[PDB]
Write a protein that binds this ligand. Structure first.
Ligand code: CA
Ligand code: MG
Ligand code: ZN
Ligand code: ZN
Length: 269
């Protein structure tokens, strides 16, 4: 029997790929999510894990019997190296454009963020993404019968996006949400409370939390699997129901508490 993935797994610890629900598959690592949303017209790849995870993601797509070349669109959560890291390499392998909201694009072209990113000073470089299609903040990415809807999720980064779509197992369809990271973390310099340094940034973060909280939400997945207890819901260690219509509300509500705790820590400094 397989031991599965721990909640404290290394970001590059390999995971056996598995179904999440219907035509949504998990192809990431034990520590970092990536998803493949499939059809007989081609596929949408969601996220890219670290700069080291390219071959793992490609091997996992193939392990499930899908061809990387049948991927017709790549989307991602946010422009940190641990989720955007292999985007260039995956774009080479698949031939697919990468869709990005405007505030993430400069990071993807430079290979590093600027000071708009809370983690600017700790960012690790990523291969620049050659072919980017600009995504409207509520845009839809369509491949054949597939339709992924962008929910702009600035806060953790300026360019972050959550994704939502429907996956079906027969006549039974579920609203999938791949909710972006909502953690109020930063380098040692950035202050979420210094509005003059970035006007409206924290208000947009709060608005993001409210919007995620309100999403129709049958099955939640997050870029760090443990942030949503993913490995208690799929895989060998699962002992909670996969479907939970409260999950996005609990996730966003938790992130709000932690954001407020971050503001308290800044006030004390
Ligand atoms: Ca996360
Ligand atoms: Mg468990
Ligand atoms: Zn991040
Ligand atoms: Zn991350």
């Amino acid at each position: 029997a397989s031991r599965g993935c721990a909640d404290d797994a290394g970001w590059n610890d390999p995971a056996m790929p598995l179904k999440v629900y219907g035509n949504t598959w998990y192809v990431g690592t034990c520590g970092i999510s990536a998803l493949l949303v499939t059809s007989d017209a081609g596929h949408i790849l969601v996220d890219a894990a670290t700069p080291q995870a390219g071959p793992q993601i490609l091997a996992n797509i193939r392990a499930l019997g899908f061809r990387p070349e049948d991927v017709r669109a790549i989307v991602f959560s946010h422009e940190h190296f641990d989720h955007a890291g292999s985007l260039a390499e995956l774009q080479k392998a698949t031939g697919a454009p990468v869709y990005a909201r405007a505030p993430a694009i400069d990071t993807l072209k430079r290979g590093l963020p600027d000071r708009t990113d809370p983690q600017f000073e700790v960012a690790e470089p990523v291969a620049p993404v050659a072919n980017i299609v600009t995504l409207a903040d509520d845009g839809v990415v369509s491949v054949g019968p597939l339709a992924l809807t962008a929910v702009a999720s600035p806060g953790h980064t300026p360019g972050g996006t959550s994704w939502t779509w429907r996956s079906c197992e027969g006549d039974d369809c579920r609203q999938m949400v791949y909710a972006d990271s909502l953690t109020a973390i930063s380098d040692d310099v950035f202050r979420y409370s210094d509005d003059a340094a970035h006007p409206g940034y924290l208000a947009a973060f709060r608005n993001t939390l409210a919007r995620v909280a309100a999403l129709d939400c049958d099955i939640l997945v997050t870029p760090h699997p443990s942030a949503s207890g993913l490995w208690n819901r799929i895989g060998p260690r699962a002992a909670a129901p996969l479907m939970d219509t409260t999950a996005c509300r609990r996730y966003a509500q938790g992130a709000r508490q932690r954001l407020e705790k971050r503001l308290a820590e800044e006030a004390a400094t």
